[PDB]
Design a protein around this ligand. Structure first.
Ligand SMILES: *[C@@H]1O[C@H](CO)[C@@H](O[C@@H]2O[C@H](CO)[C@@H](O)[C@H](O)[C@H]2NC(C)=O)[C@H](O)[C@H]1NC(C)=O
Ligand SMILES: *[C@@H]1O[C@H](CO)[C@@H](O[C@@H]2O[C@H](CO)[C@@H](O)[C@H](O)[C@H]2NC(C)=O)[C@H](O)[C@H]1NC(C)=O
Lengths: 50, 98, 84
């Protein structure tokens, strides 16, 4: 029956970990978009005149 | 006109190409080289009046003064057709008589 | 730890500051030509003259009102430093 209990714990922690990973992916995509915008601004407004 | 958007340097033109799951650009760009050094000045005071360049910049190799464009070296004699006058010169810093 | 860990970044802060100082010294000394080929020296007067000529105002204004502009810029940078 310890195997039953361990199955319960494993499935619960698996859903928790999956949720964390998905949130991390979304936030990383947003930060990448912002970084691309910042790179464009630095390449355009600094090395020249806008 | 936006620098360093497409290419590296001044931009001229481009050609597209195909690919399996993408596109390929061949930007044709313009890059200067073989630089030289000269002595500059912001304006010239003549007859009490300050003269400024219409476009370009004043340069000199030591003995004579010329006006040239900003991205290439071509010398022209200073005349009253490529320069414009604006008042008298007493506050400009760097004037040189000629 | 307790299961998780935080890895260090590849670039340390000193290198970042070095990059920023390089860019800033380059844009002070050469203008914008250092973004295309080799950097060329240019005095800081006839760089602001070009920048005004870009936005429509002729270059007479800068060479006839230099001290006022210098004071304006110094006061502005002092104010932003104090506000921060
Ligand atoms: C700066 O360039 C000018 C333009 O060529 C030089 O002036 C000429 O010099 C040659 C020398 O062989 C003379 O034959 C010409 O009569 C000059 N032209 C004029 C309009 O004076 C000048 O010598 C150069 N200065 C230096 C230091 O090299
Ligand atoms: C450019 O040359 C002119 C002509 O000599 C200079 O004008 C005079 O220069 C003398 C020399 O210092 C002064 O004493 C006079 O007051 C100036 N004006 C007049 C009406 O004679 C002018 O100063 C020279 N420019 C520079 C920057 O030296």
């Amino acid at each position: 029956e310890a195997e039953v209990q361990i199955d319960r714990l494993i499935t619960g922690r698996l859903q928790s970990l999956q949720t964390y990973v998905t949130q991390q992916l979304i936030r990383a995509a947003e930060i990448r978009a912002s970084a691309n915008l910042a790179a464009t601004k630095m390449s355009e407004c600094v090395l020249g005149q806008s | 006109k936006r620098v360093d958007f497409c290419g590296k340097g001044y931009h001229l033109m481009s050609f597209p190409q195909s690919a399996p799951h993408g596109v390929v650009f061949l930007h044709v760009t313009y890059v200067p080289a073989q630089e030289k050094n000269f002595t500059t000045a912001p304006a010239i005071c003549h007859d009490g009046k300050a003269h400024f360049p219409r476009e370009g910049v004043f340069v000199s190799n030591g003995t004579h003064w010329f006006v040239t464009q900003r991205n290439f070296y071509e010398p022209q004699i200073i005349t009253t057709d490529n320069t414009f006058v604006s008042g008298n010169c007493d506050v400009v810093i760097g004037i040189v008589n000629n | 730890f307790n299961g998780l860990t935080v890895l260090p970044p590849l670039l340390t802060d000193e290198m970042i500051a070095q990059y920023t100082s390089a860019l800033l010294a380059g844009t002070i000394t050469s203008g914008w030509t250092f973004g295309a080929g080799a950097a060329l020296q240019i005095p800081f007067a006839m760089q602001m003259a070009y920048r005004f000529n870009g936005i429509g105002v002729t270059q007479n204004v800068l060479y006839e009102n230099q001290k006022l502009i210098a004071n304006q810029f110094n006061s502005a940078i002092g104010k932003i430093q104090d506000s921060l």
